[PDB]
Every structure is written in structure tokens, then in C-alpha cells.
Paper text:
Our structure confirms that human Pol I consists of 13 subunits with only one subunit forming the Pol I stalk. Here we report cryo-electron microscopy (cryo-EM) structures of human Pol I bound to different nucleic acid scaffolds as well as in complex with initiation factor RRN3 at 2.7 to 3.3 Å resolution.
The DNA–RNA scaffold mimicking the elongation bubble contains a 19-nucleotide RNA primer and a 43-bp DNA duplex with a mismatch over 12 nucleotides. The well-resolved DNA–RNA scaffold enabled us to build a large portion of the downstream double-stranded DNA, the DNA–RNA hybrid, and the RNA in the exit tunnel, as well as a portion of the upstream DNA. In the active site, we confidently assigned positions of all bases in the DNA–RNA hybrid. Further, we traced the RNA backbone extending into the RNA exit tunnel over a length of 16 nucleotides in total. The 5′ end of the RNA oligonucleotide used is self-complementary to the 3′ end of the exiting RNA oligonucleotide, and thus we placed an ideal double-stranded RNA helix (A-form) formed by base-pairing of two separate RNA oligonucleotides into the exit tunnel that fitted well into the cryo-EM density map. Subsequently, the RNA exit tunnel widens up to ~30 Å in diameter, conducive to the accommodation of the double-stranded RNA.
Residue numbers in the entry:
A (entry chain B): 1 to 1085, 1092 to 1135
B (entry chain A): 1623 to 1719
C (entry chain A): 4 to 99
D (entry chain L): 12 to 58
E (entry chain J): 1 to 67
F (entry chain A): 296 to 344
G (entry chain A): 788 to 1032
H (entry chain A): 395 to 639
Amino acid sequence: MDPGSRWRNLPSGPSLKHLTDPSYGIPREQQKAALQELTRAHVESFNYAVHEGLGLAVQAIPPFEFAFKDERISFTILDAVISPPTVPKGTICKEANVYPAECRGRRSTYRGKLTADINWAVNGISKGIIKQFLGYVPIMVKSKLCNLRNLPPQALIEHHEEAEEMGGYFIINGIEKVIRMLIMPRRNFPIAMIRPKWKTRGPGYTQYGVSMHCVREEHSAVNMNLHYLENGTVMLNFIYRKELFFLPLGFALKALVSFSDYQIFQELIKGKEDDSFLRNSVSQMLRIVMEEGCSTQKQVLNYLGECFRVKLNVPDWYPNEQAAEFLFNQCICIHLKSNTEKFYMLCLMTRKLFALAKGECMEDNPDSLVNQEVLTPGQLFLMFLKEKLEGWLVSIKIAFDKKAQKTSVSMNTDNLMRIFTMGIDLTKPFEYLFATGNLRSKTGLGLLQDSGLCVVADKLNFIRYLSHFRCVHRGADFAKMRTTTVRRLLPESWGFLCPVHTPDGEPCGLMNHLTAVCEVVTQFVYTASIPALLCNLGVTPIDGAPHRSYSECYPVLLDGVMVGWVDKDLAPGIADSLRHFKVLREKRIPPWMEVVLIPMTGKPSLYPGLFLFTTPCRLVRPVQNLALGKEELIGTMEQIFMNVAIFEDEVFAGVTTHQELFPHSLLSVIANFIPFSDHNQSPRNMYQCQMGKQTMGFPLLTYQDRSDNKLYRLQTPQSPLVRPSMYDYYDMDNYPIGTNAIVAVISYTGYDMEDAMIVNKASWERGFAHGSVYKSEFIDLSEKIKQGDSSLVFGIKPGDPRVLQKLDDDGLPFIGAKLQYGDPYYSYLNLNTGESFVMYYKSKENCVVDNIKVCSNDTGSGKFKCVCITMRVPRNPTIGDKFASRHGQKGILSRLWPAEDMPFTESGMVPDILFNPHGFPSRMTIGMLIESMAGKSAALHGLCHDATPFIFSEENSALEYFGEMLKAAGYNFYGTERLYSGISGLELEADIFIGVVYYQRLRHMVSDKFQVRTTGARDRVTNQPIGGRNVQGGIRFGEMERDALLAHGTSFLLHDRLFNCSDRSVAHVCVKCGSLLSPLLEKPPRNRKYNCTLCSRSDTIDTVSVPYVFRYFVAELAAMNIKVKLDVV
Amino acid sequence: KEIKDVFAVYGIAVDPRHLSLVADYMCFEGVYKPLNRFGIRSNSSPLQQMTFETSFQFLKQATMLGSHDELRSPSACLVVGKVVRGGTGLFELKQPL
Amino acid sequence: SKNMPWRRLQGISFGMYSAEELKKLSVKSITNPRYLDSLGNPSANGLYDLALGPADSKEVCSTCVQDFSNCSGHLGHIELPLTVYNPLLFDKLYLL
Amino acid sequence: QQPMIYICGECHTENEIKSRDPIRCRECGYRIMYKKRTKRLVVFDAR
Amino acid sequence: MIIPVRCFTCGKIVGNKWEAYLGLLQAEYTEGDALDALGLKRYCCRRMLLAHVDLIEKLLNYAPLEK
Amino acid sequence: VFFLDFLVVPPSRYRPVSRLGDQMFTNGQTVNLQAVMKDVVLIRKLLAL
Amino acid sequence: YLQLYRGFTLGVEDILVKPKADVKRQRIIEESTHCGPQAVRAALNLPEAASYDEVRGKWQDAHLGKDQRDFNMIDLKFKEEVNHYSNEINKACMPFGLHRQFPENSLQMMVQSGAKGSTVNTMQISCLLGQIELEGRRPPLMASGKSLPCFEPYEFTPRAGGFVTGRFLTGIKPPEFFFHCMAGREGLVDTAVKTSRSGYLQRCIIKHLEGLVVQYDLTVRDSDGSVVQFLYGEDGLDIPKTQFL
Amino acid sequence: QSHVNIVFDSEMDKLMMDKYPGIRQILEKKEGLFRKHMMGKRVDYAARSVICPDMYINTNEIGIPMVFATKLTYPQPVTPWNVQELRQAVINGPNVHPGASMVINEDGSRTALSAVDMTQREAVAKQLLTPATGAPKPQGTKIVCRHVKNGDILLLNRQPTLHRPSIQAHRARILPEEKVLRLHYANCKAYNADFDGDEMNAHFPQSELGRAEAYVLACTDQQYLVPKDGQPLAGLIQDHMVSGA
RNA sequence: UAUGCGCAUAACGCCACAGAG
DNA sequence: CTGAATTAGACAATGCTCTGTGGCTCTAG
Ligand SMILES: [Mg+2]
Ligand SMILES: [Zn+2]
Ligand SMILES: [Zn+2]
Ligand SMILES: [Zn+2]
Ligand SMILES: [Zn+2]
């Protein structure tokens, strides 16, 4: 193919020789690079954000100045470093470094140490530099700051980590939490869109407007909108601290440059010279500023600083000119750093707005992936870190404000900088984001989302665990909205997002996953040479004359910087030269550059221009450039103007420019694990991607080192005999999730209709699909048992008859031990008192203790009070457990059928799973039939067959191939055998299709789902039963059940279910005045009579029978002075 | 006829007696009334209006007007814990002495 | 044992109360904004005062002598110093 | 009689821990310690 | 994890054939011929040993005592 | 009845505090009544002034 | 009967097609390749001597246009043009041309005895998936005018517009796989969205019509005595009992 | 004034933080007071588990596990013509089926039966059927809360409950060593259930009125026709319509 | 109210994620 | 010098049941 290509080691077929290799189980000298690239976006974004983006971010924070009694005091941050996780100081250890296994088993946070070199100055002269500790920031595992960096797999085995361990996660309180990739708008690109809700925003606003998402070096993000008004005037929306401000365009364009008004005029009419409506409109916009006495740039800056100083909150000694410069730096086109470049980009956004509003270009779809990119974890980390550094400086100013209000004895600051200790500590506000996902900002960080930013990366199996690092989420705001247009599969996500791998239900179409070849640009390069390179080509500079009409030219954009203009007879030549330079790596053009040339059709197509993108966070995928014969990374917008080919046969000269690496590159990592997926119906492939991730498999290799809440383990998993080649590329036999089963497709028992399935009893009694679940309960005597005195330690009072031969002498169960219900679970004694308490085991499932680990605090000074018991619950397959094939065929076990009653073949073989053939016609999973024929051939010949999709055509069919294999093995061509009846003895007249299908055991068991409530706890407000099966509560008889039982005509059955079995209370009313609130019992002298408080007569009080919620109702209406009068007759 | 034409596009045949009852209810008052929270203002029972929608507005209207509920609605019989009048509740059983 | 109710609701009416009728219904003027003291018990003249009901089974009432399982519950009132509108009737007060 | 042995996570040395003393390994100072499994009869069914 | 004692489908003892299978495959037999030389005739028996992934050698690299 | 001289405190069994291991948590009804009552105390001191 | 004496299964011999019928199927597919531009000229009303660049230019004009009535007519004429080849393939393979016919065919016995499945399902297994139709139209075009990156912009062939002409028996090539995934996702999203529209309707109708019961005079009265019907359903009869009348 | 507004309605006052939901939000909405706690309620004496098929029970029957059958009780009063059955049920106790969880005495005091010793349960079984004791309450007899046994009626239910056959009363048949409810195939079109992980609620009526109108009205045999158009909806499904044909 | 033996202990919401049908 | 229709803003609703875990519920002044 191509050397140095990342996809050249993809195997031609699945082998099975690694399972029996003599070097199996010996850890390799180097980690498998196929697996390390699945989390490479996470790691490389965090590596940028912590080393280089942190230096750029602290250079971006302006020097913070404020007012003392007499003199201005300036604070600037010269440097900020994040240190790798070490032990606290004053800790006696042999190893200073902390590793993630400790923070994962002790349930701590794997924290770095942020410290900054803050400089301070009084009266403009720098008096001294302060190195100062700010807080502890979390560390992504296997970053440049993790202590597992650069270690071989033997050294990762030594430190209790996985061999072949990738890390894109944070340990936050012992929990692996991943920042999933959110979909953002395309950065630094004018997205012209139509939104009718913008018409409800001003007096004459139209539905047309150009959005813009400006990010500055991945540490700032500012959304801004131009709007179109019906008189041709443009308003400029900009948001500052989550609130919107509307400025006419002439003020911004006149404040950014010192140009004349005629020169600003010529930049806005530049394409459309003769459209006299635009000419009158932009002369009117320039006239608006002239009418308000702003004839120079300085007067516009003065006016804009006057009008925005209250909301903006500079010190009161800045001029108004500087206060407007502050808003143009914090709010307007922040990716640019020069004001003339802001002028030219803002003129381009206005010209695109004029072309949209005059019906001449088309709406950029915000839902198409062309106009979108990804939010990486390093970007969110670095934005939140820059905001917390700025807030830390403001907290120091508030500290001087408090010491000017309270301790104003006029002590000079002569290294009086232990007031930095009185500043805020940003450990807890930084960990709140990574611990909850909720974003508490004052800026909002340019996001449109406040929550769900961090998600638990749980490790149910490895197929689920890979899906957190490939997931691209659309937004949490979209699941609530009931529209079906953001949930569409659009064709512009060919090869970038997977078509099958998406959930079902509420997140269907929103929670998308990357394809296996797709990858996020995370490298950052210097693009200082690229505009001079473009001007060496035909791109005229933006000041110089373009030597042709601008109506016969293209606007050039290099990363949101408008470079210039190209003669349209030269622009395909420049685009091909840039693709040539990119794929041959010639003139320091990055290999991840998107060279988009949107052509001038003369029709209402997309807005034309030569757009060049080199920024990070874009999705990019490898194809092969057929003209050069080398592999090219093409982007999402770049793809829609290319004709890639899928197969060798589809390549035509002069038509197809590119070609995919392999035809199944449109699918996920996970969706490439479905055998023969082009023979299944597509919802049945979408169901398998979901239930392949719910499988009780083999999660991990470090069971004693892992302290997490539940952990589902399959006992003897098997490699699939029929699997795609991606199963062996990603080495998925390290963590296999299923067993091969001899599946016979027969209607034999009466228990397999309607999705149910039959398992051989004798296979289940041998080791078929047996399992375990490891529950880890972290017991802390400080946190839960808060009685006081802080001196609780695990232990027993010696001679206690509650713990004899049932807990050990440390008050903590034995490690071989079993735990039934009500057994002593742990014992703890109070040391300042002497009294020992015992805690009992309240779960209803018999477990076996696995290990007990005992934890200190971070110093090694903690006392014997934190412990983490891990228990094994058996969970072998029972009636009611759910299995699945690899094709979307889920099914509850209905019956464990004996082996003597099972239909035996002529080979002497029973099946171990019976499948009902009526799961095929409506679902059309033909790939399950091919998998059974292929698995039977693979077992018989001793092979391993390739089940990669799109390798079988109609000429060379799959059924012809595997039938010739079965014919060569002396079996039937069509997969059927002569079975006999195990109940009758007679040979069945039909010819029964049997094979080998690889089944999966899902984690949904009936032992976690049944519940029964006779009587029990009641809600303390309404006296109705409570909800939940862990609290042993009741189930609802809701409104639609009430309706359907009214339709039966059974009224005493509703009276039963909804009055006698929820809340039958007996209230006392005064029959005269009709009031529950009025009766009252006499204070005793017995007698026990009631008095109506209203009419003062004891005769009229009698009982009625009301719900208790009716009494709560009449009391809460009495709280609003509403009288409820009863007619009690 | 319009409800029949809606369901008959999809091959669904709702019996004509259901449609005749629904149309006889929606045209009880001489006008074509919707089945929403603006057609429930005409209802006799304040508790059924509260259990349907905007319970505080119908509570406020029932308190201002001094509205009486006869407790014969199926919602009003289940608020106060009384056997619903339809089905096995249209009648009473008496024991002869 | 014996079914204590044999009466039956025939109808329910919604109206408002006069303030004299609540001041007869109320058993304690509630004054103290502090619910619980240092020793954990409910305060005097607070929102959890025992002249109202007990809020749990650990205590008894003051007006009646029953426990949590037999006390009906009792109304109290926060005597406002000056007059506020009634939010149920503020729209109709604005119209009048 | 029969001390409570705990095993360090890193150096795997055996540690006796009483009630009042701070928990850390006596050799390497490590923070996680695993409880030792001792000889004691538990009955399982082969089924 | 570890080689099953019996085949799942029929009760043929297959647990004593794992080291023989590895010694046959290291002696340059085909996997079909190595399954024939062990007497695994039914393909139920034959997938038990053909598809066995032996996670206990990977799971014993984390052997605790290292002494 | 258009005006209030006093709020009505509903019974305390309909306003329960939800404790869970040495931390009390008041429900919303008692909190809104307390936010009335602190302001009542404030006005009463100001009319005293 | 299915335990003791007869068995029942579904092999691959129940879904296979005879070789001669597969030759007929394959040449109808080859003819279906070339039915592109006539369906565009039929909708845009062009003379049949118009070039392939002029028809493509006017179909770039029907697309990219705010009217969107010429474009829907072009999609309509494409669907009508490919439905002919769909019907020819289903005649060439389905009744005869299967390897086994009913009753010996088990999939035909499940379909035709009403057990499980449809005839459309059996045609999709053994003949073609046919036209993929998203919300009543052909699958969408990109902003450049191409339906997928493997196709030309404004390509006339039915393969570039969702006409799959592959089957699950032999497999589906990657573009038809992506089109079928579009259709499967819109089905899943549609069933996710139908339920909250059908539930609030039923709630409103229940909360109005709940009081209506039949009285002892045979009048359907509301809970306040208001007479809705004087006989129930205009004749007085019960729906489960009018079935043999 | 705005604090009093927040007491009555926490949406009358905008522009004020540290509010909690007032009495309107106690009353109005989903998760309000009417819809969450008056029109639908949590309920005692009910169960819920995954359903599995069963053909070897009748169509009007449900399969109750021993997990639920020794936990769901019925308050059977003690008459002289059922005191042998209830006496054997008291002797068996709360963990042996058919048994009893407790014996309610004539004054309302609940004598809980002991799972440990048979001496107490023998002493209680002797003490049944005796007349009014030294307490002056002669109005009633003892009530034995005996387990659900074969023949007891249970209302089954599957959400969403869209029409009237989505809740039907099935007779119980007690099945050992399971945790699933066993449903016949003829009921699956009524409940829209298909054994891929569905769950069903089994409510257990506690009065003779509820039992007697679950045997008569809401029985499975009476729900044969759908109320929509009077067509049948109980019938055999997949394997049966192949082997009968 | 539940557990344990009249006695001792435990007596919950709100968000956000994930999932089942 | 005032009733008139109109239009913008406010507001209320948007399927059902069930299972889990994890963080926070008064931290900031
Ligand atoms: Mg289902
Ligand atoms: Zn009275
Ligand atoms: Zn009281
Ligand atoms: Zn150590
Ligand atoms: Zn075998």
C-alpha cells in the first residue's frame, strides 16, 4: 500500500495463532499502537493544554491593576506550571510519586499541583516576584504529567495497571471520568444561517444572520452574530459575561481601523459593486456613526467606552478609549490579535450576510458536520483554568478590599504578600467541574451547554470502555427538544461519524461515534509562512489591487484571517498546489490542512471562496490521493467537493480524485466487530452496538487493584471463531465478551416463541456462560458514622457475643468468608468510650468476600477507619437472564431444557441453545445464518473465518463460500442436519439448520429486577408507599392504569388499589359546619371527646373516611386561606 | 367522518359508535368545542378540572365563585376516596330485614 | 376493630375563610425564626413548635396529648405586622 | 495470639496493625494495605 | 480463563488436552490436524479447544508475592 | 379576604425535615415561611425604631 | 406435532433463488443502471435532445431553489421510474424462481400462514431492498449536489439516489449500507417521537370523556346528568356483541 | 409581599433567588399532588418481575414464583368451614408454601407468626376459631394472612397501559425455583408483550369485592375481543400457525 | 416503618449521568 | 377627546413504568 500509513498493518484475515503462541502471556516490549490511537485526542489535547496552552493562556491574562489608598498596584502572572502527582510534603515514603492505582483504590483524586510565578508592582516598578501555590488540578492518565508516562508494559504490570493501557480519563474520587467530545460550531468560520427566532430580537431584525465562533489558541471562546435589518443595516451582537449587547456595525468597523469612511465603504461593497441597495445601506451605516458626533476612530472609542463601562467594570482611572479596546479584545473576533485583521474578517462576514439576505448564497446548515467540530478535553480544561486564574486575581483584590475596610492601619506592602494565602484556593471549584460535569462560569466558556460535560467512563467491558473515547455528543439541550432534524443521518458525515453506532430512544442520533479511521486534529503548528506562500502563488494581498474584478475572484481565508483574493482562473491551480504540498509535506504545510475551494456556480450555492483551515479540534480522515499515490488527510468541508471511490473498480480517470483505505472504513471500531453486518437489517446493527456494550464480559485483568462499585465478570470467555479483522487489529482477545454456542434453529419446545430462548440444562451445569459480579463497598467511619468525638476505629470489644467466629479480631470479616443476610458485616469500637458497635449485612444476596484493602489518608497518618470490602456474588445464568447474538437478537432465557430431551443430531451432538426461526422474517438478520454456517466450518476445519463486511459480492456469495466449506467437510451445503427427537426418538421430518453462533450474556438479570411489596415504609407526607426496590417500596398504579380499570367497570378494584392499599385514613369532621380543620381534642382531666373549635359544640363531630392525601390537600389549602366545606350526610 | 378518514389512511377501523359518542360530546352545547383545558371550563366538577390541567387556576376560580362539587365525577370520587359511579357503582345493595 | 367511619361525603365546596375563623382555628402564634436549638429539640414559638403537631414519632403534642400516630395536626399563624395583599386575589383586586 | 497481618500493595511485606497506630507500611510507607487470608474452613457446593 | 474440564455441549473431558494441544501446535501441526490428533471429532468438542483464550497466564503476571 | 393580616402555618407533620446521618434538611415550605418570618422580625424592629 | 414428528426450521435453502432467475434478476439490474436521465427530462419537461450538462444544470436549478416544487417532482419521477424495475425483479424471483416453493419453503410458510413476517420482508431478503425513501423522498443531497462522496454531483443513476437493488441474501455495498442506515435511523427516531404525541391526546380525551356511562334508562349521561346520547352509539348496542349481527 | 407571593406561588416573583417551590408547585403538574399522588398512587400488595412464556398453564393463568407466593398474602377470615385449611397454613408458616405470614386477632392486634419455632405456630393454630376472649370485642373473628395459592386472582399489567385488555385478571399457578412471571402466548397481543426483557405488574386484590369483580369482569376470558372494533386479540402465534397449517 | 432481640439500630430530597421495555 | 381592532408579550402544555451511581443539600464573608 503506502509506507508510514497507520493502517498498513491491518490484517488480511483473522488469525487464531496468537492464542496458542508460546509467547502468550509474556508482556510485550511495547504497547500495541492500534489501541493507543483511540484515546489520542484526549491525551494530546491535554498535553497541549497543560504545557504550551498554559503558557499562552497566562500570557493572555491582562496585567490586573487596582486601587490602593494612594497608588495603583499591578499584578501579573509570569508563569504557571502544573506538577506531576507526588505525595504531600512531610511524608515518609520510598517513592515520592503517586500512581493512579493508589488514587483508584483509596478513592482519591489523581491531582497535580498548580503553582504560579505571580509578579507584583507598585507605582509601575516591579518590586518582587512571588512563586505561589494556587491549588491542585486533576491529571489525565498517561499524559506528560501522569507518572505512567513512557513506561513499558512490564512496568505497567509492575504498577498494577493494565498492560495495553490507554488513558484519556481523570480519576476524580476514585472514579474514571472522561470528558466526551462535544460538537461545537466550526471555529473561526462565518456560518451564514437563517433563524426566525432572530426576528423577535429587535425592531426590524430579519431572520438572516452570520454566526461566528472565535477561539483564541484554545483558551478563549466568544460567540458573536451579525444580524441583518430590513433597511440593509447590520447590527453586531456580542456577548460579554453571558449577556447580549447589540451594536451597529459602523461603530465597530470605525473603531477597529483609522480608515476613511470611503475606504470602509469600498471594503463592504467589494464583491457587489453595482448593487445600489447595498451601496445606500452601507452609506447609511457609515452615516449613523457620523450623526452621533464620532468623526474619528478616537471619538468612536471614547463613545463606546463611555457606553460600556458599567457592564464592563474596568478600574475607574482607565480612559474611555482603553475601556473600548478592552471590549474589542474580550468580545470581537478574538482569534485575530490585530485590529485591521478584525476589520477585514468583519467585512467578510458582512459581505456573506449581504449575499445570504439577498438570496444569493445558501444557508450553511448548522446540523451538517461540514459546519461543526469537536470540543476536546484539553480545550475545556484550559478554558476553565484560565477563567479560574483570572478569578484568583480578582479574589486577591477582594482580599485587599477587606483589609482596606477592616485592617486599615496603613501597613505598606513590603513583601506583605502572605495575603496571597488569603486568596481563593481553586482546588474545589476546579474539581467540581470534573466531579459533577456542571459548569459554573461567569463567562460560559463559549459553550452553549452548562452540564453533562464529564461522564463516568465505566468499564462494564472493553467494548463499552472504548466507546467513551470515540463518542461525539451533539448536546444535552437537544434531548429535551422534540425535533427530528438534528437526529438525521446526513451524508456529509460519511467516514467521520458512524451510521450504525448510535443509541436508541432519547439519545438516538445525538450521541454519535467516530469511525475507526477518523481522528481529531490535536497538533498545533506555526502558520507564519503560509500567507507569504499563498502570495507567492496567485493570491493577491488584501490591500493590493486584485488585477481583475472582485466579482471574478475568491476570498481567501487562512484560519479565520482573510488573506486576500484570487483570480478565479488561478484558484483551482492554487488549491491543487496546496493539496500537493500537503500530501507531500513540502513547504511546512500541515498534513491536516483542509484546502476547500467552494466554486462560483453563479447559482444560489454555498458562499464561494478558497478556505484554508489548519486549526485543531477538526475531524479529519485518511483517504488516498490517487494523483500522487499517497495517503491524504481530508476534512469534513473538504470531503463534499471530492469524489472518493470505495473499491478498485469504481476508480475512473478524470472523475475520482481520491479513494478510501478499505471499504469498511465508514464504520466505528465497535461497529466493525459485527460479523457480516451488510447482511443484517440496519436497526439490528444499531441494536448490537448498544447491547454489545451491555455484555457481561471480561472487563480487566486487575481485580484486586480495582475498587469500583460493580464489576461483571464472565468466567470462561472464548474467542469468536468468525470475527472481522478489526477484532484482531485491536487485539480484542485480551478482553473477550462471549462464548461460542452450538445453536440449532428449531421450533421444538413451546418456550422459544416471541424472542425467548432455550439453554441446554447440561451445558449450563457445565461451565456455559457462568459469571460473577464483584461489588466493592467503601466503608468510611468518619463520613457515615458521624456521632462525634472523631475516634472510631474498626475493631471488636474482646468477648463480644455478636461477632464470635464471624468477624476477625480487627472487626472486619474474613477473606474466605461467606455473607448471608443478617451476618455481621463489620465492627467498630469507640476508643475514647470503649463501646463497640457492629454493623450487619443488609443485602439479600449471598456473597463471598474477595479482598479487604485498608486505606490511609494522603500522608500515611490516617487511622484504621477507611476500608474497602470487595465481595463476589455468583450470578450464574438463570431463568430470566438476557442473552444476545452478535446481530441484535436479544432474548430472555425461558427454560433450562434437559439434555436427554434436547434434539440430538446424527453426529451424536445436542445443541446448547435452541433458537426459534421466527426471529428471522421481520428482522432479516441473514448474517446470523451466515455466522452459523461460518462458525461450523471454522470449528470443523480448524480455521477462523473473515466476517468483515463488504468482502463478499453477489458474484462470490457468502453462502456459496461457506457451503463449499461445509461440503468439503462432508456436511450439508445449506447448513442443515438430520436431527432426531429426544422426546420421541424419531427422526424429525424437517432438516434442521444448526451451526455455531457466538453468544453474549447481557448484564440484565432477573435477580436485579424482581420486587414484591406486601407492607412496609410509607412516605412521611402522604402515607403512601415509597418507591424503589432497594428501599423495599411500592410500585405505581398510575393514571393510565386507573383509566383502563375504569373501563372494565370494576370500581371496587380501583377502590382497593387506590384507597385501601395506599392510604385509608379516618378524619374527624364537624357535621354541622363541614370542616376537618375544626375538631380538636380536650386536654385530659378518661373522657376523650372532641369539640368543634368553630361552633363550640361537641355533638356534631363524627368520623369520615378520606385519603391521607386529601387531608394534606385540605391543610395546604388552609395555608392559602381556602376553605373546604364538606357535606357529610 | 373526519376521524374515520384520519384512521382509514392507515388501515385502522375504529368502530362507528365510538366516533358518534365523541362527536355527540364535542357538540353537546350547540358549538364545536375542543377537548382541552378551555373546554373543561364548562365542566360541573371543580376537582376534575383540577386533576386535568392548570390546577391552580381552576382552584382559584372555584374559590372565587364558591363552586360546589357534587362528587359524581370519576376524578372527584377518587380524590375523596369514594366508590366511582360507573360500572359496579351505579347501584346499591340493601339487606332485607 | 369496629369501622369508625360510616358517614359519607355527599359534596365538597370551595370558599375562602374569614380571618376570625383562622384565628379561632390557630393554636399558636409563631414568632421565632429559629427552628431547632443547640440541643436538637424544636424551639418555642418556632416553625416546628409542639403546639402544632409533632413532626416524628419521638415526641408528643402540646394542644392535644397524642403522639405522631394519632395527632391530626394543628394550624399556627405568623402574625404579620402590616398588611400584604392576598396573592390568590391580587389580579381581581387590581381589576376592582 | 494470631496477629492481624496486612500486606502492602507495593512491597508486599507483612504488616501488623493495631487499633490506635497510624496505618502505613513499615518499610516503604505505602498507603493501601491488603488483608491477609488465613486458614479457616468454608464449605462450598460443587454445583 | 482456564481450560474447561468438560466440553459444554457433550460431557467430553477436554481439560486434559490443553498442554497436548499446545505441544502439537508447537510441533508444527495444523490446527485441524492437532484437533484430530487429540480425538476431538464432534465440532462441539473441537471449538472448546480451538477457541480457548487462556487468560490465566495474562492474569498471573500480576502475581502478588513476586518473591 | 383580599388582604392578609397573618399567614397560616400548616401542621408540622406535613412539613417534615429529612435527616440523614447528622445533617438536617428542611423542606421548602418551612423555608419560605421562615423567609417571611425573618422579614417580619426585621419590620417589627424597624417599626420599633 | 413440532416436537415429536415434524420439526420446523429456517435454513438458507429457504431464502435462496434459482440460478436462472438470478440471471434474469441480474440483467434487470443492469437495465436499471441506465434509467437515469429520462426521469429528469420527464419532470423538467425538456426536449429529449438536451445535453447531459443542460439537464444537470436545470436539476442544479431545481435544487438550490427556494421553491422546491420542481425538485420534489424530479424525486417523484425517479421513484416512479425505479418502481418498474423493482416490480420486474420481484416478478422474476418471488413466486417461482425460489429454490423451494410453498409449502416446502419455511419462510413462505411463516409469511403466508400469518405466523411472522410479510411478503415485503421476503422480497428484501431475496430480491432487492428497493428505493430507500427518507420522509417520503429520496435521500438528501449534500450542499455540493452529491448524494454521497462516492458519487458525482447531480448524478443521474438510481444507485446515487437510494435505489439499493442489493438484498440481504448476498449483501449490500457501502453506499447502499449508508442509505439504509439513514432509513433505519429515521424509523427509530419516528417511533421515539410518536409516543409523546399520542399520549397527551389520549390523556385529554380521557379527562373529558370519563364521566360518560350508560344509565338505567339507556342514555349515555355525563356525571352531572347531562344527556349526551339517548341511545348509545345511535342504536344502543355494544361493540363486542355486534360482530355476528 | 414578594416573600408571601413565593409562599403561595414561586413563579409570581421573578428576580429573586433562594426560593423553593410554593403551594402551586406542590399542586400543579406532572410530579404534582393530583397527578402524582391522587390520580395515581404507589400501592401495597403488588409485585413486578420479568415475564417468560408458558404454554403448560392455561390461558387464564399466570405463573407466580415461590419468591412472590411466599410474600404476597391474603387476609382470609376464619370461618368454621375453612379452619382446617387455615390451620395447616398457620402450621406451615411464613416460609413454607402454602403458609401464612401472620394472624390478625379480633381486636386488631397482629400476632406475627415465627419463622423459627413450630411450637408458637402450633399454639396459634390451636387458638384459632375460639370465641370472644376476655377483651370486650365480640364483633369479629381472627384473620389469617395466608399466602397466595393456586387459583387466587391477580391483576396483571404492562406499561404503557393504552387500552382495556392491558390489565386483565389471571388465576395464579405457583411455580417453584423461578423469579419470572409465566404468561401464556395468547395474552401477548393484548399486553403487547414479547419476552425480550419486558416486565409486568401483578397486583393482588385484598377484598372479596375486588376478587369477585376480578373473576367476573376483568377475567382474561372476557377480554377476548378488543374494545376498539370488536375483533379478537387473543390467538395463537408463531410456531402454532405454522404447524397447524 | 423495617431489621434484630416490650427493648436497640437505621427512618430523605434535588440535580446530572447511565440503562430497561 | 374615546371606542376601535390589532399586535406583541406572557404563559401553559408537551407518553408510561422501572433500575442504578454520584455529587450536593450553607459556602462565602
Ligand atoms: Mg419487548
Ligand atoms: Zn362546627
Ligand atoms: Zn396535636
Ligand atoms: Zn510497603
Ligand atoms: Zn463436545
